[PDB]
Amino acid sequence: ISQSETYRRRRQEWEIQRNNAEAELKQIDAQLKSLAVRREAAVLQKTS
Amino acid sequence: TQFGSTLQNIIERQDAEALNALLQNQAAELILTNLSIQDKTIEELDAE
């Protein structure tokens, strides 16, 4: 029985970390747009 | 000679008003792109 639970608890942990990964790469993904906005901005700067 | 110095003064001052007009126009043009820049940086803050 105890063996079983270990796997379950481990699974739970994996689930935890998986979310941390997804959220992380959502965060990072969003950052890309932010940087891209600054790109557009500095682009316009050169035009000036 | 008197008409001379008056005419000369008039020309030099004509050119000065020209230079002034040029300045106000080209500066009024630069503020446009600077304005668009500000809007893109606030867009960046929203991305953030």
Short mmCIF file of N, CA, C and O in Angstrom, two decimals:
data_model
loop_
_atom_site.label_atom_id
_atom_site.label_comp_id
_atom_site.label_asym_id
_atom_site.label_seq_id
_atom_site.Cartn_x
_atom_site.Cartn_y
_atom_site.Cartn_z
N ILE A 1 0.84 -1.18 0.00
CA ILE A 1 0.00 0.00 0.00
C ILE A 1 0.87 1.23 0.00
O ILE A 1 0.72 2.09 -0.86
N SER A 2 1.86 1.24 0.89
CA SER A 2 2.72 2.40 1.05
C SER A 2 3.46 2.70 -0.27
O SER A 2 3.59 3.87 -0.66
N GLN A 3 3.91 1.64 -0.96
CA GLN A 3 4.61 1.78 -2.24
C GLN A 3 3.75 2.63 -3.12
O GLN A 3 4.19 3.67 -3.63
N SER A 4 2.50 2.21 -3.23
CA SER A 4 1.52 2.88 -4.06
C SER A 4 1.54 4.36 -3.76
O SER A 4 1.77 5.17 -4.65
N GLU A 5 1.41 4.70 -2.48
CA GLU A 5 1.26 6.10 -2.12
C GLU A 5 2.44 6.92 -2.55
O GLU A 5 2.27 8.04 -3.02
N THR A 6 3.62 6.33 -2.44
CA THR A 6 4.81 7.03 -2.84
C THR A 6 4.67 7.49 -4.28
O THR A 6 4.78 8.69 -4.56
N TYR A 7 4.30 6.57 -5.16
CA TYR A 7 4.16 6.92 -6.57
C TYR A 7 3.15 8.05 -6.74
O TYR A 7 3.44 9.05 -7.40
N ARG A 8 2.05 7.95 -6.00
CA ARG A 8 1.01 8.96 -6.10
C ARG A 8 1.60 10.29 -5.69
O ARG A 8 1.50 11.27 -6.44
N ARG A 9 2.26 10.33 -4.54
CA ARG A 9 2.80 11.59 -4.07
C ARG A 9 3.78 12.14 -5.10
O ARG A 9 3.73 13.32 -5.44
N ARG A 10 4.60 11.25 -5.66
CA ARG A 10 5.56 11.66 -6.67
C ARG A 10 4.82 12.25 -7.85
O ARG A 10 5.20 13.32 -8.33
N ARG A 11 3.76 11.56 -8.29
CA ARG A 11 2.98 12.02 -9.42
C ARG A 11 2.52 13.42 -9.13
O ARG A 11 2.65 14.31 -9.98
N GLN A 12 2.02 13.62 -7.91
CA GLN A 12 1.50 14.92 -7.52
C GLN A 12 2.58 15.96 -7.74
O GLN A 12 2.34 16.98 -8.39
N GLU A 13 3.78 15.66 -7.25
CA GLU A 13 4.90 16.58 -7.36
C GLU A 13 5.19 16.88 -8.82
O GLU A 13 5.42 18.04 -9.17
N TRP A 14 5.18 15.86 -9.67
CA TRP A 14 5.45 16.08 -11.08
C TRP A 14 4.44 17.09 -11.61
O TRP A 14 4.81 18.07 -12.28
N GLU A 15 3.19 16.89 -11.22
CA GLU A 15 2.11 17.75 -11.68
C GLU A 15 2.47 19.17 -11.29
O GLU A 15 2.47 20.07 -12.13
N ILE A 16 2.92 19.33 -10.04
CA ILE A 16 3.30 20.64 -9.52
C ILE A 16 4.33 21.28 -10.43
O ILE A 16 4.11 22.37 -10.99
N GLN A 17 5.41 20.55 -10.64
CA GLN A 17 6.51 21.11 -11.41
C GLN A 17 6.06 21.36 -12.85
O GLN A 17 6.43 22.38 -13.42
N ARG A 18 5.20 20.49 -13.40
CA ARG A 18 4.74 20.71 -14.76
C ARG A 18 4.09 22.07 -14.87
O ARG A 18 4.38 22.83 -15.80
N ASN A 19 3.27 22.42 -13.89
CA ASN A 19 2.61 23.71 -13.92
C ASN A 19 3.62 24.83 -13.85
O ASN A 19 3.57 25.78 -14.65
N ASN A 20 4.60 24.67 -12.98
CA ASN A 20 5.65 25.66 -12.87
C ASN A 20 6.34 25.87 -14.19
O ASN A 20 6.71 27.00 -14.52
N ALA A 21 6.51 24.78 -14.95
CA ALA A 21 7.12 24.88 -16.27
C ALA A 21 6.19 25.66 -17.19
O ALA A 21 6.59 26.67 -17.78
N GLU A 22 4.93 25.24 -17.26
CA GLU A 22 4.03 25.88 -18.21
C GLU A 22 3.95 27.36 -17.90
O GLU A 22 4.22 28.21 -18.77
N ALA A 23 3.62 27.67 -16.65
CA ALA A 23 3.50 29.05 -16.22
C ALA A 23 4.78 29.81 -16.55
O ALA A 23 4.72 30.92 -17.10
N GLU A 24 5.93 29.19 -16.29
CA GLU A 24 7.18 29.87 -16.58
C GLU A 24 7.23 30.27 -18.03
O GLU A 24 7.43 31.44 -18.34
N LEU A 25 6.96 29.31 -18.91
CA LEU A 25 7.09 29.55 -20.33
C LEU A 25 5.92 30.37 -20.87
O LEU A 25 5.94 30.81 -22.02
N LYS A 26 4.88 30.54 -20.06
CA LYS A 26 3.87 31.53 -20.43
C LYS A 26 4.46 32.90 -20.11
O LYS A 26 4.45 33.79 -20.95
N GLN A 27 5.02 33.02 -18.90
CA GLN A 27 5.65 34.25 -18.44
C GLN A 27 6.66 34.72 -19.50
O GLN A 27 6.51 35.80 -20.08
N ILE A 28 7.64 33.86 -19.78
CA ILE A 28 8.65 34.14 -20.80
C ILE A 28 8.03 34.51 -22.13
O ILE A 28 8.44 35.49 -22.76
N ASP A 29 6.98 33.79 -22.52
CA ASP A 29 6.37 34.05 -23.82
C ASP A 29 5.84 35.47 -23.85
O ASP A 29 6.07 36.22 -24.81
N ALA A 30 5.19 35.87 -22.75
CA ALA A 30 4.64 37.20 -22.65
C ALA A 30 5.75 38.22 -22.73
O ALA A 30 5.60 39.23 -23.43
N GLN A 31 6.88 37.93 -22.10
CA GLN A 31 8.02 38.84 -22.13
C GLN A 31 8.43 39.12 -23.56
O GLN A 31 8.80 40.25 -23.89
N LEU A 32 8.33 38.11 -24.43
CA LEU A 32 8.72 38.32 -25.81
C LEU A 32 7.90 39.45 -26.45
O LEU A 32 8.48 40.38 -27.02
N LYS A 33 6.59 39.44 -26.25
CA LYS A 33 5.79 40.52 -26.81
C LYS A 33 6.28 41.85 -26.26
O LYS A 33 6.49 42.79 -27.03
N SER A 34 6.53 41.90 -24.95
CA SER A 34 7.01 43.13 -24.33
C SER A 34 8.27 43.61 -25.02
O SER A 34 8.34 44.76 -25.47
N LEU A 35 9.22 42.70 -25.22
CA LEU A 35 10.45 43.09 -25.86
C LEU A 35 10.13 43.56 -27.27
O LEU A 35 10.63 44.60 -27.70
N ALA A 36 9.26 42.83 -27.95
CA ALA A 36 8.89 43.17 -29.32
C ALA A 36 8.31 44.58 -29.37
O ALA A 36 8.58 45.34 -30.31
N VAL A 37 7.55 44.97 -28.35
CA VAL A 37 7.01 46.32 -28.35
C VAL A 37 8.15 47.31 -28.30
O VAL A 37 8.19 48.25 -29.10
N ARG A 38 9.10 47.08 -27.41
CA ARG A 38 10.25 47.96 -27.32
C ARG A 38 10.98 48.00 -28.65
O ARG A 38 11.43 49.06 -29.07
N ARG A 39 11.01 46.87 -29.35
CA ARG A 39 11.65 46.83 -30.67
C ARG A 39 10.99 47.87 -31.55
O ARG A 39 11.67 48.79 -32.04
N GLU A 40 9.67 47.79 -31.66
CA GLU A 40 8.91 48.71 -32.49
C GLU A 40 9.26 50.13 -32.07
O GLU A 40 9.60 50.97 -32.91
N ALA A 41 9.29 50.35 -30.75
CA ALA A 41 9.57 51.67 -30.23
C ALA A 41 10.93 52.16 -30.72
O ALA A 41 11.00 53.19 -31.39
N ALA A 42 11.98 51.38 -30.48
CA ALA A 42 13.32 51.81 -30.89
C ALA A 42 13.42 51.93 -32.39
O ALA A 42 14.18 52.76 -32.88
N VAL A 43 12.63 51.12 -33.11
CA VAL A 43 12.58 51.22 -34.56
C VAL A 43 12.16 52.64 -34.94
O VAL A 43 12.88 53.34 -35.68
N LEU A 44 11.06 53.09 -34.34
CA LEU A 44 10.55 54.42 -34.60
C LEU A 44 11.60 55.46 -34.21
O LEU A 44 11.79 56.44 -34.93
N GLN A 45 12.36 55.18 -33.15
CA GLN A 45 13.41 56.11 -32.73
C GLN A 45 14.40 56.39 -33.86
O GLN A 45 14.70 57.55 -34.14
N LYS A 46 14.85 55.33 -34.53
CA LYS A 46 15.81 55.52 -35.61
C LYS A 46 15.19 56.39 -36.68
O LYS A 46 15.84 57.31 -37.20
N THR A 47 13.91 56.14 -36.98
CA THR A 47 13.22 56.94 -37.97
C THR A 47 13.32 58.42 -37.60
O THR A 47 13.75 59.22 -38.44
N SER A 48 13.07 58.74 -36.33
CA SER A 48 13.18 60.13 -35.88
C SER A 48 14.54 60.70 -36.19
O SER A 48 14.66 61.77 -36.82
N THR B 1 23.41 105.25 -50.54
CA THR B 1 24.04 104.40 -49.54
C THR B 1 23.04 104.11 -48.42
O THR B 1 22.99 102.99 -47.90
N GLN B 2 22.24 105.12 -48.05
CA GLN B 2 21.23 104.91 -47.01
C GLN B 2 20.20 103.85 -47.37
O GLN B 2 19.87 102.96 -46.56
N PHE B 3 19.71 103.92 -48.60
CA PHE B 3 18.82 102.87 -49.09
C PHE B 3 19.55 101.56 -49.04
O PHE B 3 18.94 100.53 -48.81
N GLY B 4 20.85 101.60 -49.28
CA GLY B 4 21.68 100.41 -49.22
C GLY B 4 21.61 99.73 -47.87
O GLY B 4 21.14 98.61 -47.78
N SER B 5 22.05 100.42 -46.83
CA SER B 5 22.06 99.82 -45.49
C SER B 5 20.67 99.40 -45.01
O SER B 5 20.54 98.37 -44.33
N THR B 6 19.65 100.17 -45.36
CA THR B 6 18.29 99.75 -45.01
C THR B 6 17.90 98.46 -45.76
O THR B 6 17.36 97.53 -45.18
N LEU B 7 18.21 98.40 -47.05
CA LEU B 7 17.92 97.21 -47.85
C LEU B 7 18.64 95.99 -47.35
O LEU B 7 18.05 94.91 -47.25
N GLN B 8 19.92 96.15 -47.02
CA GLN B 8 20.72 95.06 -46.48
C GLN B 8 20.10 94.54 -45.19
O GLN B 8 19.81 93.34 -45.07
N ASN B 9 19.87 95.45 -44.24
CA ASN B 9 19.22 95.07 -42.99
C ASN B 9 17.95 94.27 -43.24
O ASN B 9 17.73 93.23 -42.63
N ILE B 10 17.14 94.77 -44.16
CA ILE B 10 15.91 94.08 -44.52
C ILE B 10 16.19 92.67 -45.01
O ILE B 10 15.52 91.74 -44.57
N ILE B 11 17.15 92.49 -45.91
CA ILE B 11 17.44 91.14 -46.37
C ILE B 11 17.87 90.21 -45.22
O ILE B 11 17.31 89.11 -45.06
N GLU B 12 18.83 90.65 -44.42
CA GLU B 12 19.33 89.80 -43.36
C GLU B 12 18.21 89.41 -42.38
O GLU B 12 18.12 88.25 -41.94
N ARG B 13 17.33 90.35 -42.08
CA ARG B 13 16.20 90.06 -41.21
C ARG B 13 15.16 89.16 -41.87
O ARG B 13 14.51 88.35 -41.19
N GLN B 14 14.99 89.30 -43.18
CA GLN B 14 14.12 88.39 -43.93
C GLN B 14 14.60 86.95 -43.76
O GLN B 14 13.84 86.05 -43.36
N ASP B 15 15.88 86.74 -44.04
CA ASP B 15 16.48 85.42 -43.89
C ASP B 15 16.33 84.89 -42.46
O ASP B 15 16.08 83.70 -42.27
N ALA B 16 16.49 85.76 -41.47
CA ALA B 16 16.29 85.35 -40.07
C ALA B 16 14.86 84.88 -39.77
O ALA B 16 14.66 83.87 -39.08
N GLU B 17 13.86 85.58 -40.29
CA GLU B 17 12.50 85.11 -40.09
C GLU B 17 12.25 83.78 -40.81
O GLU B 17 11.47 82.94 -40.34
N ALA B 18 12.92 83.60 -41.95
CA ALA B 18 12.84 82.32 -42.68
C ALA B 18 13.38 81.19 -41.82
O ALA B 18 12.72 80.16 -41.66
N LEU B 19 14.59 81.36 -41.30
CA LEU B 19 15.20 80.36 -40.43
C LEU B 19 14.32 80.05 -39.21
O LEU B 19 14.15 78.88 -38.82
N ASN B 20 13.72 81.09 -38.63
CA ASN B 20 12.81 80.87 -37.52
C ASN B 20 11.63 79.98 -37.91
O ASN B 20 11.34 78.97 -37.24
N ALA B 21 10.99 80.32 -39.03
CA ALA B 21 9.85 79.53 -39.52
C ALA B 21 10.23 78.08 -39.78
O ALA B 21 9.50 77.14 -39.39
N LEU B 22 11.39 77.88 -40.41
CA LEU B 22 11.89 76.54 -40.65
C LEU B 22 11.97 75.77 -39.34
O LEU B 22 11.49 74.62 -39.24
N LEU B 23 12.55 76.40 -38.33
CA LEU B 23 12.69 75.74 -37.04
C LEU B 23 11.37 75.31 -36.43
O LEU B 23 11.21 74.14 -36.05
N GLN B 24 10.42 76.24 -36.35
CA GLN B 24 9.16 75.86 -35.74
C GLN B 24 8.51 74.71 -36.50
O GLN B 24 8.05 73.75 -35.88
N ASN B 25 8.50 74.77 -37.83
CA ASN B 25 7.98 73.62 -38.60
C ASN B 25 8.65 72.28 -38.35
O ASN B 25 7.98 71.28 -38.06
N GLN B 26 9.97 72.24 -38.44
CA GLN B 26 10.62 70.95 -38.32
C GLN B 26 10.53 70.36 -36.91
O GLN B 26 10.39 69.13 -36.74
N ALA B 27 10.54 71.23 -35.90
CA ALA B 27 10.33 70.81 -34.51
C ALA B 27 8.90 70.27 -34.26
O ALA B 27 8.70 69.23 -33.60
N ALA B 28 7.92 70.99 -34.80
CA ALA B 28 6.53 70.55 -34.75
C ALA B 28 6.36 69.20 -35.44
O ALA B 28 5.43 68.47 -35.13
N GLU B 29 7.22 68.90 -36.41
CA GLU B 29 7.21 67.57 -37.02
C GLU B 29 7.82 66.49 -36.13
O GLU B 29 7.30 65.37 -36.05
N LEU B 30 8.90 66.82 -35.44
CA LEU B 30 9.55 65.82 -34.59
C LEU B 30 8.68 65.41 -33.41
O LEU B 30 8.62 64.23 -33.04
N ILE B 31 7.98 66.38 -32.81
CA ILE B 31 7.08 66.01 -31.71
C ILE B 31 6.06 64.93 -32.10
O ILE B 31 5.64 64.14 -31.25
N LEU B 32 5.69 64.84 -33.38
CA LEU B 32 4.78 63.77 -33.80
C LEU B 32 5.34 62.37 -33.52
O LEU B 32 4.74 61.57 -32.78
N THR B 33 6.49 62.07 -34.11
CA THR B 33 7.08 60.76 -33.90
C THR B 33 7.39 60.54 -32.43
O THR B 33 7.17 59.45 -31.93
N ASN B 34 7.89 61.57 -31.73
CA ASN B 34 8.07 61.39 -30.28
C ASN B 34 6.78 60.98 -29.55
O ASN B 34 6.80 60.18 -28.61
N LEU B 35 5.66 61.53 -30.00
CA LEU B 35 4.37 61.19 -29.42
C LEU B 35 4.05 59.72 -29.67
O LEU B 35 3.66 58.97 -28.75
N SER B 36 4.26 59.28 -30.91
CA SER B 36 3.98 57.88 -31.24
C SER B 36 4.88 56.93 -30.41
O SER B 36 4.44 55.87 -29.94
N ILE B 37 6.13 57.35 -30.21
CA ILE B 37 7.06 56.64 -29.33
C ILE B 37 6.52 56.49 -27.92
O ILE B 37 6.55 55.39 -27.35
N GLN B 38 6.04 57.59 -27.34
CA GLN B 38 5.50 57.50 -25.99
C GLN B 38 4.37 56.48 -25.93
O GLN B 38 4.35 55.62 -25.04
N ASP B 39 3.47 56.53 -26.91
CA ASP B 39 2.39 55.55 -26.91
C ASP B 39 2.89 54.10 -27.01
O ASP B 39 2.32 53.20 -26.39
N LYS B 40 3.96 53.87 -27.77
CA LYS B 40 4.48 52.50 -27.84
C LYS B 40 5.16 52.08 -26.55
O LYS B 40 5.10 50.91 -26.20
N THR B 41 5.78 53.00 -25.84
CA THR B 41 6.35 52.62 -24.55
C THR B 41 5.28 52.39 -23.46
O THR B 41 5.44 51.51 -22.61
N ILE B 42 4.18 53.13 -23.49
CA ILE B 42 3.11 52.76 -22.57
C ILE B 42 2.50 51.40 -22.97
O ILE B 42 2.10 50.60 -22.11
N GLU B 43 2.48 51.12 -24.28
CA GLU B 43 2.06 49.79 -24.77
C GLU B 43 2.97 48.71 -24.18
O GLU B 43 2.51 47.62 -23.79
N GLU B 44 4.26 49.01 -24.14
CA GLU B 44 5.23 48.14 -23.51
C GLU B 44 4.92 47.91 -22.02
O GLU B 44 4.99 46.78 -21.54
N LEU B 45 4.54 48.98 -21.30
CA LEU B 45 4.16 48.82 -19.89
C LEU B 45 2.96 47.90 -19.71
O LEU B 45 2.88 47.15 -18.74
N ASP B 46 2.03 47.96 -20.64
CA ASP B 46 0.92 47.02 -20.60
C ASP B 46 1.35 45.58 -20.88
O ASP B 46 0.85 44.63 -20.25
N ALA B 47 2.30 45.40 -21.80
CA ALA B 47 2.86 44.07 -22.02
C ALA B 47 3.48 43.56 -20.72
O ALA B 47 3.29 42.39 -20.33
N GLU B 48 4.22 44.44 -20.05
CA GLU B 48 4.83 44.10 -18.77
C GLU B 48 3.79 43.75 -17.70
O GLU B 48 4.04 42.89 -16.84
#
